[PDB]
Amino acid sequence: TMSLGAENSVAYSNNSIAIPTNFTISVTTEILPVSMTKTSVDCTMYICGD
């Protein structure tokens, strides 16, 4: 059965705050297409070859 990750139980309360002490600068990547191959076909040669 597919697991959706590990289970975590955030301790919620009326007087419980979690302020971070350190930081970790991370650099991610994202690959987005911006253009495709510009194509052009000839109707005559493709349909009627010679």
Add this chain to the structure above:
Amino acid sequence: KYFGGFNFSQILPDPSKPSKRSPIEDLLFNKVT
């Protein structure tokens, strides 16, 4: 489930059902066919 005073019983999953859904989601799965 005393979250300040706001009652999230309609959106949190109800344990007394085999689908483990919320009362609002129960209306959605029955209305939409």
